[model samples]
Target: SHMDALRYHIEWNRVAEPGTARPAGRLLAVISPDHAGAPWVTAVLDALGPDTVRFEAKGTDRAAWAAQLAQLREDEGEFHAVVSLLAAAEALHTDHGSVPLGLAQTLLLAQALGDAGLTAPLWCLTRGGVAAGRGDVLSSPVQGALWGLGRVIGLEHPDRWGGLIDLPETVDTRAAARLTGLLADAGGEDQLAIRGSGVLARRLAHAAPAVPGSGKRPPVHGSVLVTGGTGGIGGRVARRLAEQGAAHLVLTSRRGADAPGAAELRAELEQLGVRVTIAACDAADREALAALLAELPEDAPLTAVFHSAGVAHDDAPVADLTLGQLDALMRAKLTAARHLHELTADLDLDAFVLFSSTAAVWGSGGHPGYAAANAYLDALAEHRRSLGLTASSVAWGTWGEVGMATDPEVHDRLVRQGVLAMEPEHALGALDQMLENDDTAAAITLMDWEMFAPAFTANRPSALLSTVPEAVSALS
Candidate 1:
């Protein structure tokens, strides 16, 4: 009963004199030693002047970061703002070898700021993390994850959140001035990207209708890996692959063959004449994933990977979310997908598809952990494409009877607000449009801004929705 309605394109609109209206003041600057972003770091430091105190984050330990911030707060009294250069680092791995160290540390830094009892508004800085226009490139998709994390921070601790800023590659005088001004006072524009032309603020608007590509869907051959392929959404996706002519379907989940519908799904796919292999596997474990890859038949080498494994079943707002919850969630989404990319990077694949949630794409209020997880998925897809590989991160909205919004009360609330359930058939049809067109990243969901905008912005105005006509009509 899920999958229906509209789609959106993420855009960034120009904001005039972004920070010239507000006064700047004392600040605390946070950076990670793990990445090499010194030149821009120094430029940013000088741009902010002597009042911005420097603190190098030495490790991935959350408690260690907290200790440093606590001590800094004790010594410095208070700061008007806290801006981080940690995101620019985009440290690919933590000391323990996770693919996203900067993202993890970014999370810790925000947590530490709160733990140390510092009330200063927090602003995170990233470099080349976005594409403000069609001509621009998303240079560091890894840094892009911070936008998702920062969005939740704003939702959870609105008063203490200053927003996110993406720095230019070369921090010349004008760019530095823009950065300083935004830091001094970003006005209400929190999500911004600095460029040669000017400052651009992120916005979400309805996508123009997708032009039909060549009528033929790409051929589905070789072995297809579908993590979480036994569950509700996974089952449907797997069936589609089989119907489209996948030679071998390797459907995996934590339970593998034990998943309730696995047997039935396998029987259905086999009826379509597609070979099915349902395995009990946890794709998050590197060793476990490797074992499965090695067992893959040489004749049907992995041609596609559909990462539909993670879920947002247990989520808390940024304030209440523990490190454990974030870790588990990331392991399923970020870490699992990282392993898949690494383990199969050399293969000539047809597609590498990642299933994501709107929670990460649009920043829902209570699911920061899940938001950060799916945000990395989208970023990694861009990063992979930049390397000349095939990838698509689909940011899905609500689907039928699943997801956090599926609760009776929550479902009723969302339906009234225009966040309706997507019917699977059409959702899968749109999925073809994304792949046939080779979209790197897209958010597919049904929306009725007439109801959605008024409800979503009832408490807090979203500049992100300012460009949507329906939103404007409803808000007005």
Candidate 2:
């Protein structure tokens, strides 16, 4: 009976299910401060009708908005759905260098929603994340971050998460039709990219067959900078580079020379006949990163950078988190990575690799900020690629050997959630495969689909995962 209940929730055969009934109660619509007057917001509100409650996430102070949302959540009994126009907050403006206020507000809403115990389905609307004509997905880094955070939120609150939909520049009547259709039912998908033409969703299929290196491996010579190289995954990556004939390796962390096992790691790398440099620097600090980069010898000019520095899961649910907490989690990912991108954009490097988390690609509860941070990395990579630069963001699942997932409590929690820790070797092999390919981004990990599908769909069916063969079979 329990299994059947799970099957009902998963609802594999419901992809083509007939239209969903209209939301029974009031619909909550979130219009970011800047987007409050946007035509798109107006169009959606009009479509949803007169009873829709509109909340504005505006102004410099986030606490006030959180309080307002909390009070509303308390006052309102129940809502059929909550829709966010946060994506309208970001656009291609003359100044692409400013911080994304829209994204920040969206995250604050997510946090507030979690705290307020809102039981309605949540939907995030965005633009510029879809493939317009061809080539690559054309999206801004801020939009990318929102997408990443949305995925994690879905995983964390599947029942409440309606899904993410990307709209075109203008939400004309046709776009409005699709938008209303999605808001009505979403066809059991978790993510959709909509345009005047129709809706496009992502499908997780098998990666292409690996091409033989044939002595064509990307060179590992010269100075290679690996942030957080003193840690597990970075250290492993350092050693692998050394084995592949890296001439000089620069490893930086806040602990620097005093990081645990620094001495042993240096000795081991040195023994492998590679020159190693360990320095203390806050990668997030522009001055510190500049100084570190300045110290590179002329003969061994910095050839590549592996940005493996980041934090995870220490975030409270959105409702309980403060701006300070969000900043702390984001500094290592968003701030530091931004500085790195700005500081190194002029350099001709072999690679600009960012170590991201699966949470960004597929939302997880309790890590909204972390997911947002990694989502920034993924979008940055895409933005960089659009600029004709070398960039790849690898969204990794849990690693079994070391890092955050190694903590027994965290490990057990994640495993129970359907994300099994990945073997180091297998993980590295997948990373190698991504590096060798020409794609801008990828998600690498092993998953127990049977376990994952049930947990992921325990609350509401995920249309985003409907195309997944494993999910389909698991429901059967």
Of candidate 1, the 10-residue stretch with the lowest lDDT total is 90-99
lDDT of 1 by residue, 329-410 (tens): 7778877888898988898677999998777766888888788888888878877877777888999877775434557775
Supply the TM-score for candidate 1: 0.89
Instruction: Report the lDDT of model 1 for residue 83.
Output: 84
Cα lDDT of all candidates, in order?
0.79, 0.74
Top lDDT: which candidate number?
A: 1
Alpha-carbon lDDT of model 1: 0.79
RMSD of each: 3.2, 6.0
Backbone clashes for every candidate come to: 8, 11
Local accuracy of candidate 2 as per-residue lDDT tens digits, 329-421: 777887788888899899978888999887776678788778888888887887888888888888887889877788899899888877878
Q: Which stretches of candidate 2 lie over 4 Å from their true place?
A: 1-27, 35-53, 60-80, 88-100, 111-120, 129-133, 213-217
